[PDB]
Design a protein around this motif. Structure first.
Motif, PDB file in Angstrom:
ATOM      1  N   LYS A 118     -10.658  -3.639   4.372  1.00 62.35           N
ATOM      2  CA  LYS A 118     -10.287  -2.881   5.648  1.00 62.35           C
ATOM      3  C   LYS A 118      -8.826  -2.827   6.084  1.00 62.35           C
ATOM      4  N   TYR A 119      -7.941  -2.042   5.213  1.00 61.94           N
ATOM      5  CA  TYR A 119      -6.633  -1.869   5.588  1.00 61.94           C
ATOM      6  C   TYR A 119      -6.254  -1.683   7.029  1.00 61.94           C
ATOM      7  N   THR A 120      -4.873  -1.667   7.572  1.00 61.89           N
ATOM      8  CA  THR A 120      -4.744  -1.304   9.013  1.00 61.89           C
ATOM      9  C   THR A 120      -3.429  -1.045   8.946  1.00 61.89           C
ATOM     10  N   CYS A 147       0.913   5.445   0.607  1.00 63.96           N
ATOM     11  CA  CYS A 147       0.346   6.331   1.426  1.00 63.96           C
ATOM     12  C   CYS A 147       1.275   7.510   1.487  1.00 63.96           C
ATOM     13  N   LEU A 201       0.800  -1.255  -0.106  1.00 58.78           N
ATOM     14  CA  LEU A 201       0.044   0.016  -0.032  1.00 58.78           C
ATOM     15  C   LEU A 201       0.992   1.261  -0.118  1.00 58.78           C
TER      16      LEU A 201
END
Ligand SMILES: *[C@@H]1O[C@H](CO)[C@@H](O[C@@H]2O[C@H](CO)[C@@H](O[C@@H]3O[C@H](CO[C@@H]4O[C@H](CO)[C@@H](O)[C@H](O)[C@@H]4O)[C@@H](O)[C@H](O[C@H]4O[C@H](CO)[C@@H](O)[C@H](O)[C@@H]4O)[C@@H]3O)[C@H](O)[C@H]2NC(C)=O)[C@H](O)[C@H]1NC(C)=O
Lengths: 98, 113, 75, 122, 49, 49, 75
Positions: free
Chosen positions: E37-39, A85, A83
């Motif tokens: 739901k990423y965390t 960000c 991911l």
């Protein structure tokens, strides 16, 4: 399958030769392409016989050689991926300057 | 309602010896469409739950020792043990699966002589 | 059947080690190695074919390598 | 690796109904026909009832036909047996047998449950 | 031929139907993006013991 | 540590060229061939006369 | 074992039908076809390689076909 999971490509799943079904959780599902399990063996053009070819679990495990396993057991918790960000540090304070 | 009659009712044999159990049917249990014969042999070990030794007349079940082998074509079937060990104590209930109200035999007993 | 189509190189690649990434890596190479050790005559056949179909040395090497890699992989 | 564990076995007076339950684990339950079998003490194995893969189809042994009822709660992965109008003869160790993994018979036994004891006496 | 009760000599047709029952299927499940739901866990270098 | 699984389906497709033989009791093979000489010196035909 | 060492061409040959002959006669061909239809760009890459290695109308075709047979089945 059998208390295990993998994140396979959708098209690769749709390509592999195993008898699929609608997956509507109803009873007595009808399987398409049943000929991938049964093997008819005409011996001497005298009679015909039917076999069921056994369990494909080990072959399927081999055919997942490039897949990534995840922890479906418990809570379907995927533990592989990445991911990106960005961090807005304008509001932070050092707590130690004073 | 095929009734299963077993020839031996008690088989006391010394270890390292053969043994022959017979389960004679009242009708040929040979399904016509496939030509197979549906006769099963279970063994309930003393103080245990029954197992499945030969899931056909002569095709033995998985996990069964090498010595258990069967025979028989229409009504006279056999269970041949090659070399009896000390674990073979039990009750060798035969069974026919040909018809829906399937009935077991009385079941022989094997002990060490 | 199913084993012939491993989920290798599909495109989704991540940091986490994949399934059987240690064993299933050299499986294809070991297949060809065992096949070559078991059937030696096709080596001579491939040498003959590469010599008689390749006019350049690099062509001969490529043809020989591809012939060795194609037949055990085929069966 | 499959595990079939019995439940519900206890003492009961004649004429009082009882419901047996066979809890299943280690395999997909909805695809397997299940059986109920009993062994009266010192007596040969006697099959009681069978329920096939489809829930509707059931069969019972004539000696117990009309007195029992067999049900399948496959959503919970368990089998249900309903015993009604119990007789002091109807005391035995009751088993839960799975369908055969490999073979030709639609109904056969390959794995037997641990066994439960039900006693019908006064 | 005649050994099988048929007067005509030649090749005959034959079919073999068998009911196929499936045990232990494999489920394939998609994930919709409205339920993922990423965390992210953030830890400061507090110098804690 | 994870066990791989049951290799029966893979074995059945790894035997895709082998010849089946019936194995129940006596392992009566049914594929093969035999060379035999026929010495027909002592052999006669009935009712020549 | 793994479905990568079939008993296709080696050993005995008899008059009886070998186990799973008709089902598996075209198995690898179907595998190659489905792989090619799933990954088309390698056809372009193979054309490039063939047309830029040792070109003569027989070699340019044999190398292309041999590589297009090698890569999918090898996988
Ligand atoms: C697929 O293959 C399976 C097995 O290979 C077949 O299974 C059959 O199932 C039926 C029931 O679904 C069985 O019927 C039982 O037949 C018993 C035979 O008794 C007599 O048989 C003669 C013929 O020889 C008849 O003419 C007589 O009229 C008798 O029926 C019968 O006794 C029994 O009824 C008794 O038991 C039931 C349950 O306990 C009681 O409810 C009933 O009142 C009675 O007391 C059954 O009717 C049949 O035997 C099975 N056949 C075999 C070979 O196992 C399937 O039929 C096949 N097809 C399908 C689609 O599954």
């Amino acid at each position: 399958m059998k208390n295990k999971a993998w994140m396979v490509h959708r098209q690769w799943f749709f390509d592999l030769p195993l008898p699929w079904a609608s997956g509507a959780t109803t009873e007595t599902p009808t399987w398409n392409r049943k000929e991938l399990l049964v093997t008819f063996k005409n011996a001497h053009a005298k009679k015909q016989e039917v076999v069921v070819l056994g369990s494909q679990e080990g072959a399927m495990h081999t055919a997942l050689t490039g897949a990534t396993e995840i922890q479906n057991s418990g809570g379907t918790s995927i533990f592989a991926g990445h991911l990106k960000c960005r961090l807005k540090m304008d509001k932070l304070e050092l707590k130690g300057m004073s | 309602h095929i009734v299963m009659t077993q020839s031996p009712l008690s088989l006391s044999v010394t270890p390292g010896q053969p043994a022959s159990i017979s389960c004679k049917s009242s009708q040929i249990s040979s399904w016509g469409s496939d030509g197979k014969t549906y006769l099963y042999w279970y063994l309930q070990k003393p103080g245990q739950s029954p197992q499945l030794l030969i899931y056909e007349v002569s095709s033995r079940f998985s996990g069964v020792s090498d010595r258990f082998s069967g025979s028989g074509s229409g009504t006279d079937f056999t269970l041949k043990i090659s070399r009896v060990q000390a674990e073979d104590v039990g009750l060798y209930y035969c069974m026919q699966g040909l018809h829906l109200p399937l009935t077991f035999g009385q079941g022989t007993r094997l002990e060490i002589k | 059947s199913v084993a012939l189509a491993p989920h290798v190189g599909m495109g989704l690649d991540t940091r986490t080690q994949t399934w059987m990434s240690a064993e299933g890596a050299w499986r294809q190479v070991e297949k060809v190695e065992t096949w070559a050790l078991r059937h030696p005559g096709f080596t001579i056949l491939a040498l003959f074919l590469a010599h008689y179909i390749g006019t350049s040395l690099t062509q001969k090497v490529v043809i020989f390598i591809l012939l060795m890699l194609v037949t055990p992989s085929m069966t | 690796q499959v595990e079939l564990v019995e439940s519900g076995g206890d003492v009961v007076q004649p004429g009082k109904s009882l419901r047996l339950s066979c809890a299943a684990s280690g395999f997909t339950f909805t695809n397997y026909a299940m059986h109920w079998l009993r062994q009266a003490p010192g007596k040969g194995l006697e099959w009681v009832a069978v329920i096939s893969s489809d829930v509707n189809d059931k069969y019972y042994a004539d000696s117990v036909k009309g007195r029992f009822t067999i049900s399948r709660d496959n959503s919970k992965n368990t089998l249900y047996l309903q015993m009604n109008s119990l007789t002091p003869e109807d005391t035995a160790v009751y088993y839960c047998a799975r369908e055969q993994a490999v073979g030709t018979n639609p109904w056969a036994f390959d794995y037997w449950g641990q066994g439960t004891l039900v006693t019908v006496s006064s | 031929g005649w050994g099988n009760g048929c007067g005509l000599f030649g090749k005959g047709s034959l079919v073999t139907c068998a009911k196929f029952q499936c045990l232990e299927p494999i489920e394939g499940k998609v994930v919709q993006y409205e339920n993922l739901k990423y965390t992210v866990i953030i830890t400061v270098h507090t110098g804690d013991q």
